Write a protein that binds this ligand. Structure first.
Ligand SMILES: Nc1ncnc2c1ncn2[C@@H]1O[C@H](COP(=O)(O)O)[C@@H](O)[C@H]1O
Ligand SMILES: Nc1ncnc2c1ncn2[C@@H]1O[C@H](COP(=O)(O)O)[C@@H](O)[C@H]1O
Ligand SMILES: [Mg+2]
Ligand SMILES: [Mg+2]
Lengths: 152, 152
C-alpha cells in the first residue's frame, strides 16, 4: 500500500489498482424520548446540504467506542444517559475503512454549529419519502432500528 | 474547491479546510425469499475482510438508480424481480458525497468474485452480535429494514 495523501481525517492510499481512503473509526448514538428520536443537523460541505443524522463523531486518540459515544452525546446535545452497544458497520467498504459503532442511549439527563432536531422517527421517514429531507447512514439506521425494536 | 487527485471511483478535493472525496452515487437491493435475505460477500481490500452486504454497486453513466439496481441484482446474483424504491442515504456526509439509493426486490426470477449468501436476517444479526461477521451499511440497512417492515 502506497500513500498519495495524509490529511486531518483521512489518508488517500493506493493498493495496486484499489484506491483506499483510510479514515478514523466513528460512533453514533440512537436516543429515543417520549416517541421522539434525537436527530442533529449541521452544514456538510461534502454534500452541499444538511442531512438528518443522529449524534455522531470520530473516536479520538485514547478512547474506545463507548467513551466516544458518551462524549459526542454530551458535546453535540448537552445530554448523557445509559449507553448500550448495538452493532457496527463499514460505511462504504468498497473504498473506505471507516467503521461506525452504534449505541443506544436511555434515561437521558441534561448535563450542559450543530442543530438539535427532536423528531418522531415516523415523521423523519415520511419527510424523507417526500423529498423534504436527506438521510445520512446514521440517521437512516436510527429510523430503521426504531421501527424494528423500539415501538414497544 | 481544488483537486489533489482524480481517480477511477473517486476524486480527492480540498474546499478550504474541508477534505472532500467525490464519489459516484450507488444503489443497494434488499431481497427477501422464504424468510431468507439475499446477502453477498466479496474481498474488500479497503477493509482487509469480507463484510456481509446486499447486492449493490455504482451507477454507471447514462443509467438512473432503478436501472442500476436491476443491473447489480442481475450481475451479482443472476436474478431479476419487481423493484420498488425505498429510500436513500449519504454513507458518510462528513467527508464524502457518496449517496446510496436502496430498493426492494420481489418475485425473484433467475435469468442467468462475489459470494451469494442467502441468510435469515435474524441469523445475520445474531452472527454479527457474536463478532462472527461484519456489516457494511447496506447489509445492516437490509437487516434493520426487514425486522421493521418485512416480518409480516
Ligand atoms: N477501491 C477501488 N479503487 C479503484 N477501483 C475500484 C475500487 N473498488 C472497486 N473498483 C473497481 O470498480 C468497479 C466498481 O464495482 P463495485 O466494487 O462493486 O462498486 C469494480 O468492478 C472494480 O473493478
Ligand atoms: N471533511 C473534513 N476535512 C477536514 N477536517 C474536517 C472535515 N470534516 C470535519 N472536520 C473537522 O474535524 C472534526 C471532526 O468532527 P465531525 O465532523 O463531527 O466528525 C470537526 O471538529 C471539524 O472541525
Ligand atoms: Mg468528529
Ligand atoms: Mg460497482
Amino acid at each position: 500500500r502506497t500513500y498519495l495523501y495524509r490529511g486531518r481525517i483521512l489518508n488517500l492510499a493506493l493498493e495496486g489498482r484499489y484506491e483506499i481512503v483510510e479514515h478514523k473509526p466513528a460512533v453514533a448514538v440512537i436516543a429515543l424520548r417520549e416517541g421522539r428520536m434525537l436527530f442533529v443537523r449541521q452544514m456538510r460541505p461534502a454534500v452541499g446540504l444538511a442531512p438528518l443524522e443522529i449524534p455522531a463523531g470520530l473516536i479520538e486518540p485514547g478512547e474506545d467506542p463507548l467513551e466516544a459515544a458518551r462524549r459526542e452525546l454530551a458535546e453535540e446535545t448537552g445530554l448523557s444517559g445509559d449507553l448500550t452497544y448495538l452493532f457496527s458497520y463499514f460505511v462504504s467498504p468498497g473504498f473506505t475503512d471507516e467503521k461506525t459503532h452504534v449505541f443506544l442511549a436511555e434515561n437521558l439527563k441534561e448535563v450542559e454549529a450543530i442543530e438539535v432536531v427532536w423528531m418522531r422517527p415516523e415523521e423523519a421517514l415520511e419527510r424523507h419519502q417526500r423529498g423534504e429531507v436527506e438521510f445520512s447512514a446514521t440517521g437512516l439506521v436510527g429510523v430503521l432500528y426504531y421501527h424494528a425494536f423500539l415501538r414497544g
